[PDB]
DNA sequence: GTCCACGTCT
DNA sequence: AAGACGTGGAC
């Protein structure tokens, strides 16, 4: 608001220029490359992302190349990062850019914001870093920093609250170098102004911070500690040939873990067991199996639910037509398919049990 | 174990 | 709105 913004900016950027970290997506400011990195970093920590970004870009060097890829290739590249919709949207958006915008990522916030997977944070991030457009790039990190600097006690969960912080950015932003400013802000929240025990002693902008002066940084920002989970018990069948082929299946185009492959499963609700599994299997494609007592139970967390998995090894005797989205996959071909992490562990637990 | 990441869409 | 949508880095 009021506020010595000009020198705040000089302190922040001075720090950022010096203390800046080595990240592959910083090695240049190609809008495609920048855009990929910001999609990968969504709800994902920087260290996690680094090898993904490197492999992805290596496999899909240009915007054009991502557009020409089969959806499944792109999914496999994303295997493990989570929030798999991001990659379906990125793929789609890049096709639109190739057709509608002739391969070049739009530097107008409205054109860009209309693309799939691109929300307000990503508009600011990508366009400021890659094009110097002075849009705010407000995310969790920035709101933490700003909530502390200006002692803003709004629930960081409310839709309206990001808009409040964006306005604060608009006011204090350094329009000379919006990209640098934006990233500095973000990287400060990321490395220094951390959720617990921020490193205020080392903070380039300590002198401007109200939270610090009032000794309340650690009770900011305010966010609902939001409860629940929903536990979801789930039986999983790892069924093999005499021939080494394994029965796997492809999840639906939408909903949870869209288009990923899995070992066949169903929700046991209680913990009755392989019975429903045996029924499944049978009820589908002929298929008579002999399931043989669970080899492991383990939990697997999603943001909005937990799978309680129990995995049943089993043997196959045949099944007229296995069709639909099911498949008999030779063991050595399992690596070609994209599995959610849950089922990669299912397979790991399984392959172990039968050394 | 907990928290929440360089959030978006509905 | 408020809830769906994955996973692990860093404590
Ligand atoms: S002083 Fe402490 S709280 Fe204020 S910005 Fe720097 S790190 Fe965050």
Residue spans of the domains in chain A: they are 1-21+134-229, 22-133, 230-355
Distance CA A37, CA A51 (A): 11
Cis link prior to A221 (omega < 30° from 0)? yes
Q: Which residues, in sequence order, are CB contacts of A83 under 8 Å at separation 6+?
A: A42, A43, A44
Do residues A235 and A277 make contact, with C-beta atoms less than 8 angstroms apart?
yes
Assess contact for A248 and A314: CB atoms under 8 A. Answer: no
Per DSSP, helices labelled H in chain A are: 5-19, 31-40, 46-59, 63-68, 71-77, 85-100, 109-113, 120-131, 140-150, 159-172, 178-191, 210-214, 274-278, 341-353
Burial of A184 (0-12, 13-18, 19+ CB in 10 A): buried
Nearest of A100, A103, A35 to residue A64 by alpha carbon: A103
The contacts of residue A193 (CB under 8 Å, 6+ apart) are A141, A144, A145, A148, A199, A200, A203, A217
On the 0-12 / 13-18 / 19+ scale of CB atoms within 10 A, A129 is buried
> Which residues, in sequence order, are bridge partners of residue A155?
A222
Q: Which two tokens stand for residue A135?
A: 């849009």
Q: Are A22-133 and A230-355 in the same CATH fold? A: no
A190 lines ligand 1 (CB under 6 A): no
Phi-psi region of A155 (alpha: psi -120 to 50; beta: other; left: phi over 0): beta
- Three-state secondary structure call for residue A114: coil
Q: Find out whether A302 and A227 touch, Cβ atoms under 8 Å.
A: no
Alpha carbons A232 and A167: distance in angstroms, whole number? 41
The residue assigned the tokens 């039986």 is A235
Per DSSP, the three-state class of A154 is coil
Architecture per CATH, A1-21+134-229? Orthogonal Bundle (1.10)
Question: For A230-355, CATH number?
Answer: 3.90.79.10
CATH no. for A22-133: 1.10.340.30
* Breaks (C–N over 2.5 Å) after residues, chain A: none
- Taking the C-alpha atoms of residue A111 and residue A115, their distance in angstroms, rounded to an integer, is 7
What 8-state DSSP symbol labels residue A282? B
Known binding-site residue numbers of A for [4Fe-4S] cluster: 193, 200, 203, 209
What secondary structure letter does DSSP report for A259? T
Q: Which among A172, A200, A218 is the best mutation to test ligand 1's pocket, defined by most ligand atoms within 8 Å of the CB?
A: A200
Contact A11, A205 (CB under 8 A): yes
- Give the number of other Cβ atoms within 10 Å of residue A180's Cβ: 19
Q: Rounded to an integer, what distance in angstroms lies between the CA atom of residue A105 and that of residue A135?
A: 16
Technique of determination? X-ray
Provide CB contacts within 8 A for A78, sequence distance 6+: A52, A56, A84, A86, A87, A338
**A51: Cα within 13 Å, side-chain hemisphere:** 4
Write out which nucleotides of chain B lie closer than 7 A to a protein Cβ: 3-9
Strands A265-266 and A231-240: antiparallel
Is A38 an annotated catalytic residue?
yes
Q: Is the CB of A195 under 7 A from strand B?
A: yes
Our CA dihedral for A57, A61, A67, A70, rounded to 10 degrees, sits at -60
**Which residue in the list A1, A7, A19, A38 is annotated as catalytic?**
A38
**Rounded distance from Cα A1 to ligand 1 centre (Å):** 18
């Amino acid at each position: 608001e009021r506020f010595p913004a000009r020198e705040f900016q000089r302190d922040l950027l001075d720090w950022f220029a010096r203390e800046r970290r080595d990240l592959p997506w910083r090695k240049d400011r190609d809008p495609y490359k920048v855009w990929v990195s910001e999609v990968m970093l969504q709800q994902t920590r920087v260290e996690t992302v680094i090898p993904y970004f490197e492999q992805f870009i290596d496999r899909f060097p240009t915007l054009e190349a991502l557009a020409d890829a089969d959806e499944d290739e792109v999914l496999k590249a994303w295997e493990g990062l989570g929030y798999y919709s991001r990659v379906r949207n990125l793929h789609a958006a890049v096709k639109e850019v190739k057709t509608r915008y002739g391969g070049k990522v739009p530097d107008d916030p409205d054109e860009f914001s209309r693309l799939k997977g691109v929300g307000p944070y990503t508009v600011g991030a990508v366009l400021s870093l890659a094009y110097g457009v002075p849009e705010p790039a407000v995310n969790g990190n920035v709101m933490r920093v700003l909530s502390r600097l200006f002692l803003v006690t709004d629930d960081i969960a409310k839709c309206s609250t990001r808009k409040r912080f964006e306005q604060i950015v608009r006011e204090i932003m350094a329009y000379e170098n919006p990209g640098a400013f934006n990233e500095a802000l973000i990287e400060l929240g990321a490395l220094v102004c951390t959720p617990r025990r921020p490193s205020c002693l080392l903070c380039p902008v300590q002198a401007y911070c109200q939270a610090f002066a009032e000794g309340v940084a650690e009770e900011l920002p305010v966010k609902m500690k939001k409860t629940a989970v929903k536990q979801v018990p789930l039986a999983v069948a790892v069924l093999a040939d005499d021939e080494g082929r394994v029965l796997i299946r492809k999840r639906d185009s939408t909903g949870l873990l869209a288009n990923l492959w899995e070992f066949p499963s169903c929700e046991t609700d209680g913990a009755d067991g392989k019975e429903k599994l045996e029924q499944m299997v049978g009820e589908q494609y002929g298929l008579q199996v002999e399931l043989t007592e669970p080899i492991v139970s383990f939990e697997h967390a999603f943001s909005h639910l937990v799978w309680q998995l129990t995995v049943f090894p089993g043997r196959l005797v045949h099944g007229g037509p296995v069709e639909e989205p099911y498949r008999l996959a030779p063991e050595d071909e399992l690596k070609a398919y994209a599995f959610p992490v849950s089922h990669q562990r299912v397979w790991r637990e399984y392959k172990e049990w039968a050394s």
